[PDB]
Design a protein around this ligand. Structure first.
Ligand SMILES: O=C(O)CNC(=O)c1ccc(NC(=O)c2cc(Br)c(Br)[nH]2)cc1
Length: 357
């Protein structure tokens, strides 16, 4: 905990540009999401309070009050004081308020990670769940010290997309602003949301969710009438801004599958054109979400995945299931290939124009 306060940037992220400050919120929220994955938390409420603090309330089982025999303290204190983990959020807060409903209300206060008293019973209750409220230390965080609604909203919405049926509410008490995120459609609903202001060219969103060689692979995609590529890549719900081996495998499987379809069904022959990866990527919206037990990144930022085995897992699953999708949905296949041929014709005609005088 003293080591965390000494080098706060290492554990929570950049402590000056706002990255670290908002990651304090996301770490506490991630604990509530793990309970929702376990099947107990149905709703999470995140509130930005007027005094520049944030609270997160879940309706799960509540953190164990049962006391540790070796440590001699409540199991909730062990989670809050021992090593991202919630102890990091606790170490870098000037104050943190813990409230556990489990059928008794338990309360504890911390200051700079150190508890004022043990976890004591305050009253009685029928409900269940955990509440954590924290005041981030202004010794640690500089420049950007105030929480920003839109930064918390963007990530909690994607966390809803990424975690099947988890209700997340966001409340800003400074100005009354509210949001409720609860997308039951999941990453398929992510793609719908990403294409809501675009024009989708075919009705059936491609989707699968599989597990091979200890790697979870989940993909959704859909083409629009535009010419932009917009792939969003995730590893254990952490976004990779700069892609990596998940994105490579996705791209590899996709060029291979569509070319194989266009060759076999006789599209390439009739057109007299050879389609490339760039032709297929135009108008594409996609989300690639992988589950890796021990993932390797390029740096501590996790902007790029470098686990080489993830490429093969994504590539192989994509090849099989995208090929199944094309045959089973021939009208979608015909629209998408029609767009790809026209992009290939335009590119090849443009390349032919430069050389010809
Ligand atoms: O110890 C056992 O054997 C069983 N324990 C559990 O099942 C168990 C149940 C709940 C939690 N914590 C949370 O849901 C949580 C943390 C924060 Br921060 C927020 Br908000 N919610 C942790 C362990």
């Amino acid at each position: 905990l003293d080591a965390v306060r000494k080098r706060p940037g290492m554990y929570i992220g950049d402590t000056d540009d706002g990255t670290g400050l908002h990651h304090m919120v996301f770490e506490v929220v991630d604990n509530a999401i793990d309970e929702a994955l376990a099947g107990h938390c149905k709703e999470i409420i995140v509130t930005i309070h007027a005094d520049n603090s944030v609270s997160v309330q879940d309706d799960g089982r509540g953190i164990p009050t049962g006391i540790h025999p070796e440590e001699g303290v409540s199991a909730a204190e062990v989670i809050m004081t021992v090593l991202v983990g919630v102890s990091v959020v606790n170490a870098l807060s000037q104050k943190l308020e813990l409230v556990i409903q489990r059928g008794k209300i338990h309360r504890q206060i911390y200051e700079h990670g150190v508890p004022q008293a043990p976890l004591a019973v305050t009253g009685e209750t029928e409900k269940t769940g955990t509440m954590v409220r924290f005041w981030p230390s202004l010794e640690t965080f500089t420049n950007v010290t105030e929480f920003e609604y839109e930064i918390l909203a963007k990530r909690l919405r994607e966390l809803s997309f990424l975690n099947s049926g988890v209700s997340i509410r966001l409340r800003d008490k400074r100005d009354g602003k509210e949001d409720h995120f609860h997308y039951e459609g999941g990453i398929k609903a992510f793609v719908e949301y990403l294409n809501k202001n675009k024009t989708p060219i075919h009705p059936n969103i491609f989707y699968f969710s599989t597990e091979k060689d200890g790697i979870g692979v989940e993909v959704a995609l859909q083409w629009n009438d535009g010419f932009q590529e917009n792939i969003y890549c995730f590893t254990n719900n952490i976004p990779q801004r700069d892609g990596g081996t998940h994105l490579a495998g996705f791209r590899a499987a996709m060029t291979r599958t569509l070319n194989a379809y266009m060759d076999k069904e006789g599209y390439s022959k009739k057109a007299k054109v050879s389609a490339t990866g760039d032709d297929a990527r135009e108008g594409l919206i996609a989300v690639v979400s992988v589950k890796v037990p021990d993932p390797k990144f390029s740096s501590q930022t996790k902007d790029k995945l470098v686990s080489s085995e993830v490429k093969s897992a994504v590539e192989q699953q994509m090849n099989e299931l995208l090929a199944e999708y094309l045959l089973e949905n021939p009208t979608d296949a015909k629209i998408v290939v029609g767009k790809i041929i026209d992009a290939a014709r335009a590119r090849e005609a443009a390349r032919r124009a430069r050389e010809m005088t």
